[PDB]
Design a protein around this ligand. Structure first.
Ligand SMILES: *[C@@H]1O[C@H](CO)[C@@H](O)[C@H](O)[C@H]1NC(C)=O
Ligand SMILES: *[C@@H]1O[C@H](CO)[C@@H](O)[C@H](O)[C@H]1NC(C)=O
Lengths: 49, 96, 97
């Protein structure tokens, strides 16, 4: 995620990789949504289930 | 120039503008807040000496000078970059 | 000597002091008076120590409370019309304590 001049950009790629942890083989990321938030962001938090 | 809606008898002080901010504004960034400016070293919170309200009234009256008239300003931002566009003008559709 | 004076002239005869050949430090102004109206028009109260000027005039006069709000560019009243009129194109500051 990024917030240059607003325009929130979300990049993603879903694949069942080897599954130990962060892989070593290279993988690309395909942008999914690019939406102009145009606000101020300083802090970040994640939700659960 | 908009003096017919932004002016009335006995004045109108509804508008606002900021003169006291700790730092600069970055382009296209809003800083709506009411925090009293720090003067000297006092953590003072309030009005009076060395404790100034960040924004003062932009009061407008029907009888001001041209430089003091209630000018109405609207700006338009464009993005002339390589991306799927949304807004156009006249449109013809001659077949490819 | 302009803010430690004891006989600030009246508004009808406003004493005008020409300030020349000096370094304008505004901390001596900030520590000398617990201000109540330090509004500026051409510069910023914060931005004063980083700009260089040709000449400075300090007009000093003691006046009533509402007349403080009266004193401003493009104003009216018994003081703004007959005693002291601030030009609409004024590049400076007023200080009231
Ligand atoms: C955004 O937030 C940061 C920290 O909260 C602050 O320093 C900055 O001035 C803010 N910018 C705007 C445009 O609100
Ligand atoms: C005048 O100067 C003296 C000496 O620094 C100081 O103590 C006093 O507060 C000053 N008074 C005014 C009105 O500036």
């Amino acid at each position: 995620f990024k917030n240059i001049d607003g325009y929130f950009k979300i990049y993603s790629k879903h694949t069942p990789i080897i599954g130990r942890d962060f892989p070593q083989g290279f993988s690309a990321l395909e942008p999914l949504v690019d939406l102009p938030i145009g606000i101020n962001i300083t802090r970040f938090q994640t939700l659960l289930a | 120039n908009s003096n017919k809606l932004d002016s009335k008898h006995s004045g109108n002080y509804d508008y606002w503008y900021r003169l006291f901010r700790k730092s600069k504004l970055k382009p296209f960034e809003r800083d709506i807040s009411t925090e009293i400016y720090q003067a000297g070293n006092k953590p003072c919170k309030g009005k009076g000496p060395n404790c100034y309200f960040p924004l003062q009234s932009y009061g407008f009256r029907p009888t001001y000078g041209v430089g003091h008239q209630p000018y109405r300003v609207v700006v338009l931002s464009f993005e002339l970059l390589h991306a799927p566009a949304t807004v156009c003008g006249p449109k013809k559709s001659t077949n490819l | 000597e302009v803010f430690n004076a004891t006989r600030f002239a009246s508004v009808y005869a406003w004493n005008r002091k020409r300030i020349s050949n000096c370094v304008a430090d505004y901390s001596v102004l900030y520590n000398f008076a617990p201000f109540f109206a330090f509004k500026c028009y051409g510069v910023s109260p914060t931005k004063l120590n980083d700009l260089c000027f040709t000449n400075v005039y300090a007009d000093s006069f003691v006046i009533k409370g509402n007349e403080v709000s009266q004193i401003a560019p493009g104003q009216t009243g018994n003081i703004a019309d007959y005693n002291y009129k601030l030009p609409d194109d004024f590049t400076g500051c007023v200080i009231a304590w």
